[PDB]
């Protein structure tokens, strides 16, 4: 039993040491413990003496995971994460880029950031990226060094659903630092200068989500099933009696109306992709299957049954 605790102890020590910075890989249990203590200590010291006092501030509640706090903060801030080689090659970008600039992550990854910045601004940005080169001591994390911290602004091309519209830009601000990889890259939070209060939800987190409504012959809500609130936010009583058209994106109204005419004519139908305004003020992309139910005896239209599918931005844009 002593050999098992000794072996588990060695495993823990070796794992601990593998995480230690520096060229040399020390194996000595004592050395590893000394250096680990030194690291945690230099980290408390540095995080207590940093320039940005915002890093010491009480921000995230204990019950809130890092993941959720990051999603929430990025949304509130109209920001996404972006990592680009000093080369200018994008190596990473947050999913939220899609709702902010209407690019798919696959549009950006393995591409040059200069393809998305106006040519007039290229040289300056080149400078920012190429100029800064820093050597970091093993003891002090690169991202804790003020010299490695940096902010700058520039325009970034917005993606689009239609190629017709002229190239259009968003003014943004990079707040990031330089980091070394196992080359050198610059990792940042990129924030749009123009606040975006209403955005599209571009990915279906759930593998698939679906809900049901019924609409009157005036297109007013008559029914909303129990699956709808976790998707669109509203409880039934909040929308019942209100026009479906109140919730559609302006740019979709026309198309939706055409679909409805087709429906009135044929009794069954499938909508085009369209945007629905959730209680939380996000557009979700839907596609809806419709059919008219007729009275059992007089055969007159009674109501429309709608089955709503939530769809990803990638599907909408693909066609």
């Amino acid at each position: 039993s002593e050999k098992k605790r000794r072996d588990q102890f060695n495993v823990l020590i070796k794992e601990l040491g593998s995480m230690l910075p520096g060229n040399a890989r020390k194996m000595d249990k004592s050395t590893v413990l000394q250096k680990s203590i030194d690291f945690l200590r230099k980290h408390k010291e540095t995080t207590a003496q940093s320039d940005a006092s915002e890093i010491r501030q009480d921000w995230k509640p204990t019950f809130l995971s890092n993941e959720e706090f990051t999603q929430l903060m990025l949304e509130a801030l109209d920001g996404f994460f972006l990592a680009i080689m000093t080369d200018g090659s994008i190596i990473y970008v947050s999913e939220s880029v899609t709702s902010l600039l209407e690019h798919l992550p696959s549009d950006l990854v393995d591409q040059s950031i200069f393809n998305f910045i106006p040519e007039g601004e290229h040289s300056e940005v080149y400078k920012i990226l190429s100029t800064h080169l820093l050597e970091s001591d093993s003891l002090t994390p690169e991202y804790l060094k003020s010299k490695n911290q940096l902010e700058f602004c520039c325009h970034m091309l917005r993606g689009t659903i239609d190629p017709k519209e002229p190239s259009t830009y968003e003014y943004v601000r990079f707040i990031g630092n330089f980091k070394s990889l196992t080359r050198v890259c610059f990792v940042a939070t990129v924030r749009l200068a123009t606040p975006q209060f209403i955005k599209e939800m571009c990915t279906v987190e759930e593998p698939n989500e679906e809900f049901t409504s019924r609409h009157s012959l005036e297109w007013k809500f008559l029914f909303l099933d129990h699956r709808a609130p976790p998707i669109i936010g509203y409880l039934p009583f909040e929308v019942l009696g209100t026009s479906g058209y109140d919730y559609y994106h302006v740019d979709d109204l026309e198309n939706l109306a055409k679909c409805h005419e087709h429906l009135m004519q044929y009794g069954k139908g499938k909508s085009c992709y369209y945007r629905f305004l959730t209680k939380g003020q996000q557009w979700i992309w839907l596609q809806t299957h419709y059919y008219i139910t007729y009275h059992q005896w007089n055969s007159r239209p009674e109501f429309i049954v709608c089955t709503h599918t939530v769809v990803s931005y990638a599907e909408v844009r693909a066609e």
Binding site: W59, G120, G233
Partner: protein
Amino acid sequence: KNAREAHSQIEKRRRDKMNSFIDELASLVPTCNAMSRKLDKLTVLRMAVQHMKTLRGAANYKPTFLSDDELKHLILRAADGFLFVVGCDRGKILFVSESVFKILNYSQNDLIGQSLFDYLHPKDIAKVKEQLSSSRLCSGARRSFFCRMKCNRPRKSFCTIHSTGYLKSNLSCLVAIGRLHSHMVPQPANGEIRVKSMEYVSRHAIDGKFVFVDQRATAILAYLPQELLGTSCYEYFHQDDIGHLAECHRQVLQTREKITTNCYKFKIKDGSFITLRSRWFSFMNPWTKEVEYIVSTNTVVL
């Protein structure tokens, strides 16, 4: 034995040194240090290894090459506004970031435990209440709204805060970030670069009364929605533009085509005028064959 003695002294010294290392290590680890109960050496070691994972360990929502701490600093450096958690039941402020003092000039101590509704403009208590009514953050749990919150030192005893957050749960609450946005438009779009213009949508009854205005409208015109709804668009148009605009109104009722107005001035909340250009259409409900409303996309003009 005498011989083995020196060696067993090397053993005892190495052991005591080791244990002292583990104790120091433990005191440096938040998780370990907190607990009142004494911890086993192997467990202090496991916890220390995990903490160390959050610092240097070891893509879903972050690149694989960034540690959790790195991501935290990356986000906080860009942070703005303040985070708050309010109980949905009674509206009690269960938490608020210290950054709140920068925004409203109230400290954490001032606010934590108080009722959020004591710090809202009375005309907003109801709307916010509606936001707290309940229904890996899902779209249905999202809430987003403007309201006026009390500022400690004052006509400026309220500031317009936009909150973005999600309903969360044993207790149900709203976790949100409140931000105070600057209204005016600096960095007017340069000639060389086509920049996206600010817009907001409004819908109007046949006679011009606001029946809907989107969140962006509060950002642009500073009015809260309940301030515009039920009022006539003509109350806000600059008198030099009233004629032209009424003419576009009358026209748009006569066609299903989009009509674009000339630029015109619109009176925002502080009584000054900004310059807008609107694209209007009368949307006809194809089921009723009746005009549902005039739908207007209003663009801020430079």
